[PDB]
Design a binder for this molecule. Structure first.
Ligand SMILES: *P(=O)(O)OCC(C)(C)[C@H](O)C(=O)NCCC(=O)NCCS
Lengths: 84, 49, 50, 99
């Protein structure tokens, strides 16, 4: 529910899939610009997050989600139908 | 009269039934993997390369 | 290995070990049968350089 | 150089010594051992394409590249009697197929 605890999990997923150390993932940093993450790793991060969070994002953020701050803001403003 | 049957056991050729079974089996394998792709594209994501 | 992905590194090392173990069931023991490792050698070169 | 090394991570993708020693071990295996008509280059390229198809099936979570990897592995299993080395790439691909 907090931004500063979903960043700590998304940095773990990015570290597992790609290999960036989790001290580099800051919410002002872009994906294909500074982290330099290719598209197969984008699909792999998407299916890992679908496995762990349970939210399904097929195509609405495949071409509209740029930075990790936008990811965590999307997670914050979508969570109103909590299954917990 | 000398006679000798030569061992030509590897000089075979397919019959009609074996040839039709090979053709229909390869065609059914192709159709099965095409249906497997149509099942895999259920989640909305396209090819793009 | 620190700056690398987990799964692919594990699977490269596992495939190379199982290839060495599976190569003992061949009927002839020649030296030119090591040529099957020419694709895995670049992968282990990248891992052993990192 | 285009499929495996950018897949193994970021420290393997942005470093140059990894590329030069990967090229070196590739040539050191290819030149004395694969300049002929034997099934050895077929089996080497088949093991790479089997691992690449399986690795693409895990990421996108799809079964068709796993089935293509089964076809390629069974195809290079019967190139020669030394093709039994492809059972490594076949047996590592059981856990991912279960997932
Ligand atoms: P990235 O832009 O390099 O693309 C990698 C991925 C895997 C996301 C690519 O878009 C893709 O989905 N390829 C799948 C292709 C496919 O399934 N083809 C079927 C027969 S051509």
């Amino acid at each position: 529910a907090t931004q500063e605890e979903i960043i700590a999990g998304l940095a773990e997923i990015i570290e597992e899939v790609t290999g960036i150390e989790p001290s580099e993932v800051t919410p002002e940093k872009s994906f294909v610009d500074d982290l330099d993450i290719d598209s197969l790793s984008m699909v792999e991060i998407a299916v890992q997050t679908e496995d762990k969070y349970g939210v399904k994002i097929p195509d609405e953020d495949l071409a509209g989600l740029r930075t990790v701050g936008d990811v965590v803001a999307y997670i914050q403003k979508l969570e109103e139908e909590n299954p917990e | 009269q000398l006679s000798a049957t030569i061992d030509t056991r590897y000089s075979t050729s397919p019959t009609l039934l074996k040839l039709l079974a090979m053709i229909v089996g390869v065609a059914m394998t192709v159709i099965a993997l095409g249906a497997l792709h149509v099942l895999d594209c259920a989640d909305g994501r396209r090819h793009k390369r | 290995i620190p700056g690398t992905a987990l799964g692919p590194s594990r699977r490269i090392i596992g495939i190379t070990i199982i290839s060495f173990l599976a190569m003992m069931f061949t009927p002839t023991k020649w030296t030119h049968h090591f040529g099957v490792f020419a694709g895995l050698a670049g992968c282990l070169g990248a891992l052993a350089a990192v | 150089s285009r499929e495996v090394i950018p897949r193994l991570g970021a420290a393997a993708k942005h470093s140059r010594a990894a590329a030069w020693t990967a090229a070196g071990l590739f040539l050191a295996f290819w030149l004395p051992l694969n300049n002929g008509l034997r099934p050895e280059p077929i089996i080497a390229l088949g093991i790479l394409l089997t691992w690449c198809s399986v690795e693409r099936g895990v990421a996108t979570s799809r079964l068709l590249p796993v089935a293509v990897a089964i076809i390629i592995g069974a195809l290079t299993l019967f190139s020669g009697p030394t093709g039994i080395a492809a059972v490594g790439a076949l047996l590592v691909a059981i856990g991912p197929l279960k997932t």
